[PDB]
Scaffold this active site. Structure first.
Site, PDB file in Angstrom:
ATOM      1  N   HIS B  73       0.820  -1.202   0.000  1.00  0.00           N
ATOM      2  CA  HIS B  73       0.000   0.000   0.000  1.00  0.00           C
ATOM      3  C   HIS B  73       0.877   1.287   0.000  1.00  0.00           C
ATOM      4  O   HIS B  73       0.891   2.075   0.942  1.00  0.00           O
ATOM      5  CB  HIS B  73      -1.036  -0.075   1.148  1.00  0.00           C
ATOM      6  CG  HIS B  73      -2.161  -1.022   0.858  1.00  0.00           C
ATOM      7  ND1 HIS B  73      -2.304  -2.226   1.513  1.00  0.00           N
ATOM      8  CD2 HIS B  73      -3.162  -0.975  -0.057  1.00  0.00           C
ATOM      9  CE1 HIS B  73      -3.373  -2.856   1.058  1.00  0.00           C
ATOM     10  NE2 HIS B  73      -3.897  -2.142   0.087  1.00  0.00           N
ATOM     11  N   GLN B 280      -4.271 -17.584  -3.055  1.00  0.00           N
ATOM     12  CA  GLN B 280      -4.534 -16.814  -4.315  1.00  0.00           C
ATOM     13  C   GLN B 280      -5.679 -17.356  -5.206  1.00  0.00           C
ATOM     14  O   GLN B 280      -6.526 -16.606  -5.757  1.00  0.00           O
ATOM     15  CB  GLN B 280      -3.255 -16.682  -5.143  1.00  0.00           C
ATOM     16  CG  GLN B 280      -2.265 -15.555  -4.763  1.00  0.00           C
ATOM     17  CD  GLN B 280      -2.940 -14.165  -4.473  1.00  0.00           C
ATOM     18  OE1 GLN B 280      -3.593 -13.572  -5.340  1.00  0.00           O
ATOM     19  NE2 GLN B 280      -2.796 -13.685  -3.232  1.00  0.00           N
TER      20      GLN B 280
HETATM   21  C1  LIG Z   1      -8.759  -3.122  -1.435  1.00  0.00           C
HETATM   22  O1  LIG Z   1      -8.438  -3.773  -0.202  1.00  0.00           O
HETATM   23  C2  LIG Z   1      -7.477  -4.760  -0.073  1.00  0.00           C
HETATM   24  C3  LIG Z   1      -6.961  -5.085   1.192  1.00  0.00           C
HETATM   25  C4  LIG Z   1      -5.977  -6.063   1.356  1.00  0.00           C
HETATM   26  C5  LIG Z   1      -5.516  -6.764   0.227  1.00  0.00           C
HETATM   27  C6  LIG Z   1      -6.045  -6.484  -1.055  1.00  0.00           C
HETATM   28  N1  LIG Z   1      -5.623  -7.128  -2.217  1.00  0.00           N
HETATM   29  C7  LIG Z   1      -5.103  -8.388  -2.323  1.00  0.00           C
HETATM   30  C8  LIG Z   1      -5.372  -9.373  -1.382  1.00  0.00           C
HETATM   31  C9  LIG Z   1      -4.791 -10.635  -1.539  1.00  0.00           C
HETATM   32  C10 LIG Z   1      -5.105 -11.721  -0.597  1.00  0.00           C
HETATM   33  C11 LIG Z   1      -4.213 -12.777  -0.370  1.00  0.00           C
HETATM   34  C12 LIG Z   1      -4.595 -13.813   0.502  1.00  0.00           C
HETATM   35  C13 LIG Z   1      -5.839 -13.813   1.113  1.00  0.00           C
HETATM   36  C14 LIG Z   1      -6.744 -12.794   0.876  1.00  0.00           C
HETATM   37  C15 LIG Z   1      -6.367 -11.752   0.013  1.00  0.00           C
HETATM   38  N2  LIG Z   1      -3.990 -10.923  -2.612  1.00  0.00           N
HETATM   39  C16 LIG Z   1      -3.731  -9.983  -3.525  1.00  0.00           C
HETATM   40  C17 LIG Z   1      -4.253  -8.729  -3.390  1.00  0.00           C
HETATM   41  C18 LIG Z   1      -3.943  -7.772  -4.484  1.00  0.00           C
HETATM   42  O2  LIG Z   1      -4.835  -6.953  -4.773  1.00  0.00           O
HETATM   43  N3  LIG Z   1      -2.789  -7.914  -5.147  1.00  0.00           N
HETATM   44  C19 LIG Z   1      -1.927  -9.105  -4.968  1.00  0.00           C
HETATM   45  C20 LIG Z   1      -2.821 -10.291  -4.700  1.00  0.00           C
HETATM   46  C21 LIG Z   1      -7.014  -5.478  -1.192  1.00  0.00           C
HETATM   47 MG   LIG Z   2      -7.445   0.941   0.248  1.00  0.00          MG
HETATM   48 ZN   LIG Z   3      -5.811   0.105  -2.891  1.00  0.00          ZN
END
Ligand SMILES: COc1cccc(Nc2cc(-c3ccccc3)nc3c2C(=O)NCC3)c1
Ligand SMILES: [Mg+2]
Ligand SMILES: [Zn+2]
Ligand SMILES: COc1cccc(Nc2cc(-c3ccccc3)nc3c2C(=O)NCC3)c1
Ligand SMILES: [Mg+2]
Ligand SMILES: [Zn+2]
Lengths: 321, 322
Positions: B73, B280
Site C-alpha cells: 500500500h 490466491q
Molecule cells: C482493497 O483492499 C485490499 C486489502 C488487502 C488486500 C487487497 N488485495 C489483495 C489481497 C490478496 C489476498 C491474499 C490472501 C488472502 C486474501 C487476500 N492478494 C492480492 C491482493 C492484491 O490486490 N494484489 C496481490 C494479490 C485489497
Molecule cells: Mg485501500
Molecule cells: Zn488500494
C-alpha cells in the site's frame, strides 16, 4: 439549602417536564452530572455494571466540561434534558422488560454524549466554509461523528473509564450500539428513520407489551427513541418549550451573523425571521409526524405528550393572525 | 534514463504497463510522472486550466504521503490504480458516457485512494484501539483517512490544482471523489457486486453497445465499480506483474502478523502457517473473478482480453499446488 432545593427538584426525574433549567442553576451548572448520577442510582446501573461511584462522577464532569458554555442551545443543559427524556421513554409500560440492562445503558450514555463539543453551527455551515471538521469527516454526519469521537475519547482520561468492569463482549456491543444510536441523530436521516418506524408500527406485534426479536428492530426502536428525546422540546410544558426556542433562535442568528461576515447567502437572519411561523412548520412537517408515529408504537402510553405538542402547536399558531 | 522512461511511458494506454521499471527510472516518482503523462494525454491541463507547476507540486506532495516502507500500500500501488482506471475509462462500451469532470474525479480518487496507509487492516486498527478507529467510529477507517489526507494537501502552497474550477464544479467533484474512495473498502464489496449484477441484468445500450447512464446514482455506481476493479486488477495483469504484487501483499500481511503476535494479540497474516498459492486461487475464485466477470458482462465484449489473463493466472497458480 441550595442542595436541599436541588435534591427536591431531582424527585421529578421520572416525570415528563422536569425543571431542567432550575436544576442547572441549583447544581452549580452541572445539570448533566447530577441528572446522569440520579438516573444510574435509580436504575441500579452502578451495581449491575460495577461502576465505581467516583469514576462515574469524574467522567460525567469531564464530558459536561466538553459542552460549550457559550452556545445558547447545543450545550450541557440540552444534553441533560435529552438523557432525562430518554430515561422516561425507556420506562414506558409498552416496553417493560423488553430492552436488556446493556441496551438501557447504551441509550442513556448515547443521550449524554450526543452533542458534545457542538460549535453552535450546522453541518452545512461547516461543509461550506471548508472547516477542519468537514475535511476530517468527508462532509458526512460531520458533527455527529465528532460527538462520538469526543464521548469515547474522554473515557481514556484519568479515572474516567465507567466501562472498566464490563466484559470485552459487553463493551464491543455497547460501543456498536452507541455509535448506531448517535449517528441516527443527524437530521439528514430523519425521513429515512421515520419510514422505518412507520413500517414497524404497521407490522407491530404485541402480548396479551412489544415484541422484538432481533437486533435490527431493537436498534431502530432505540435510534428513534433518542431522536424523539432530541426533538422533544415542543412536547414539553410551554414555559420549557419557549425557552428552548429562544435559545435555538439565538444560535441560529449568531450563525447567520457569521455567514454575513463572509458574503455567504443567509440560510438564520434576525431581520427576516418569522419565529412563530417557523415553529408551526417545524412541528407540522417534522416534529408531529415523528411523535404521532412514536405514540402509535407505544399506544396509549404517550397520549399526554402528544396532547401537549398539539396544544403548543395551536398556541404558536394563535400568535400569527 | 530520461529516454528509457519516455519510451516506457508511451505504453500508458496499455494494460500491463511496466510500472515497477517506471518507479525505478523516475527515482521513485511513478505517481508523479504517471499522473502527469495522463493529464497531458487526456488534455486535462487545458480543459481545467491547471498551471503545470501546481500539478507537479501537488503530485510530489501527494506521493511523499505514501509510506516508502509499506510493501504493497504505497505510491507504486497508487500509480498502478491510476493507470488501470485511465485504461478502463477508455472502454469502447463507455465511449462518451462520462464528462471531463467525472473523468477527473475517477482519476483523482484513484491517486489518493490509499494515501498515508500504515500497512495494516481496518480490523487491526479497530482491535488496537487505535486513534484512527476512535476518530472514525470503526466505519471505513482507512478509507475515510485516505480522503481527508488527499484533500488537505490541496491547501498547501501551490498544490490547489482545482483553483480555476468554478464552485459547482468543486462541490460535485468533491462529492464524487468521496463516494468513489469510500467504495474501495472491501466490507462494501458484496453489496456493490450485487448492485452491479442488477445493472447488467437491466442494462440499456445503443446500437454500438455503448452504455446509457442518465442519473447520478447509476453513473457514480459505475465509477465506484470501475475504481474497485482497478484496485483489484493485479490478478488480471501479465503474470510477471501479478507475482510481484503478490509477494508484496504477503510481506505486508506477515508484518501485520508480527505486529500482532507481539502485542499479545491473537495472530490473524500467519507466515509459519500460510499457503500463498491456495490463498490466491481462493481469492480469485471467491472475489476477483466474480467481480471482473460481472464487469465483463457490462462492457461485453471489451473486457475479454482482461478476463482471459485473469483465468490464465488462476490456472498457473493452481499448477503451483502439488
Ligand atoms: C482493497 O483492499 C485490499 C486489502 C488487502 C488486500 C487487497 N488485495 C489483495 C489481497 C490478496 C489476498 C491474499 C490472501 C488472502 C486474501 C487476500 N492478494 C492480492 C491482493 C492484491 O490486490 N494484489 C496481490 C494479490 C485489497
Ligand atoms: Mg485501500
Ligand atoms: Zn488500494
Ligand atoms: C437534532 O438536530 C437539530 C438541529 C438543529 C435544530 C434542532 N431543533 C430545533 C429546530 C427549530 C427550527 C427553527 C427554525 C426553523 C426550523 C427549525 N426549532 C426548535 C428546535 C428545538 O429542538 N427546540 C426549540 C425549537 C435539532
Ligand atoms: Mg445533534
Ligand atoms: Zn441534540
Amino acid at each position: 439549602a441550595q442542595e436541599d432545593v436541588l435534591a427536591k427538584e431531582l424527585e421529578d426525574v421520572n416525570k415528563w417536564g422536569l425543571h431542567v433549567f432550575r436544576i442547572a442553576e441549583l447544581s452549580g451548572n452541572r445539570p448533566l452530572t447530577v441528572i446522569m448520577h440520579t438516573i444510574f442510582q435509580e436504575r441500579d446501573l452502578l451495581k449491575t455494571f460495577k461502576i465505581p461511584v467516583d469514576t462515574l462522577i469524574t467522567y460525567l464532569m469531564t464530558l459536561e466540561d466538553h459542552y460549550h458554555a457559550d452556545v445558547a442551545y447545543h450545550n450541557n443543559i440540552h444534553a441533560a434534558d435529552v438523557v432525562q427524556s430518554t430515561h422516561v421513554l425507556l420506562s414506558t409500560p409498552a416496553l417493560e422488560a423488553v430492552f436488556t440492562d446493556l441496551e438501557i445503558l447504551a441509550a442513556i450514555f448515547a443521550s449524554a454524549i450526543h452533542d458534545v463539543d457542538h460549535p453552535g453551527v450546522s453541518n452545512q455551515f461547516l461543509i461550506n466554509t471548508n472547516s477542519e471538521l468537514a475535511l476530517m469527516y468527508n462532509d458526512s454526519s460531520v458533527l455527529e461523528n465528532h460527538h462520538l469521537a469526543v464521548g469515547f475519547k474522554l473515557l481514556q482520561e484519568e479515572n474516567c473509564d465507567i466501562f472498566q468492569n464490563l466484559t470485552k463482549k459487553q463493551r464491543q456491543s455497547l460501543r456498536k450500539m452507541v455509535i448506531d444510536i448517535v449517528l441516527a441523530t443527524d437530521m439528514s436521516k430523519h425521513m429515512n428513520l421515520l419510514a422505518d418506524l412507520k413500517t414497524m408500527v404497521e407490522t407491530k406485534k404485541v402480548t396479551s407489551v412489544l415484541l422484538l426479536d432481533n437486533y435490527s428492530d431493537r436498534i431502530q426502536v432505540l435510534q428513534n427513541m433518542v431522536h424523539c428525546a432530541d426533538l422533544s422540546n415542543p412536547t414539553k410544558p410551554l414555559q420549557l418549550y419557549r425557552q428552548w426556542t429562544d435559545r435555538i433562535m439565538e444560535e441560529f442568528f449568531r450563525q447567520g451573523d457569521r455567514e454575513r461576515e463572509r458574503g455567504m447567502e443567509i440560510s438564520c437572519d434576525k431581520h427576516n425571521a418569522s419565529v412563530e411561523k417557523s415553529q408551526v412548520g417545524f412541528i407540522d412537517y417534522i416534529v408531529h409526524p415523528l411523535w404521532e408515529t412514536w405514540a402509535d408504537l407505544v399506544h396509549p402510553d404517550a397520549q399526554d405528550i402528544l396532547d401537549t405538542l398539539e396544544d403548543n402547536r395551536e398556541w404558536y399558531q394563535s400568535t400569527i393572525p
